[PDB]
Amino acid sequence: IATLAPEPLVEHKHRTLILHLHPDHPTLLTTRSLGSDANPTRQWIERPTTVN
Partner 1 sequence: GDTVTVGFHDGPNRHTCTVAHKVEFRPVGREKYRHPPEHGVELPCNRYTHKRA
Partner 2 sequence: YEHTAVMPNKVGIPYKALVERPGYAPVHLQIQLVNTRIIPSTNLEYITCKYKTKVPSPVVKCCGATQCTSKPHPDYQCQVFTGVYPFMWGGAYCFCDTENTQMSEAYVERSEECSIDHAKAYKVHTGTVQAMVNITYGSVSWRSADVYVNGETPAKIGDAKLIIGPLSSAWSPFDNKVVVYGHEVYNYDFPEYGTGKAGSFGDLQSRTSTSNDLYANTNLKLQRPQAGIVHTPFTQAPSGFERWKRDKGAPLNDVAPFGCSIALEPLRAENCAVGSIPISIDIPDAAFTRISETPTVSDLECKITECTYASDFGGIATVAYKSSKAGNCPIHSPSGVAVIKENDVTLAESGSFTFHFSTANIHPAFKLQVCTSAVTCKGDCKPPKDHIVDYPAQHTESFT
Interface positions with partner 1 (CB under 8 A): 1-5, 23-30, 44, 46
Characterise 38 by phi-psi region: left (phi > 0), alpha (psi -120 to 50), beta (else). Answer: alpha
Q: Is 34 within 8 Å of 40 (Cβ atoms)?
A: no
Give the interface size with partner 2 as a residue count (CB under 8 A).
25
Task: Decide which of partner 1, partner 2, none touches 52; Cβ closer than 5 to 8 Å per partner kind.
Answer: none
Distance CA 29, CA 13 (A): 20
**9 touching partner 2, by CB under 8 A:** yes
38 forms part of the interface with partner 2 (CB under 8 A) = yes
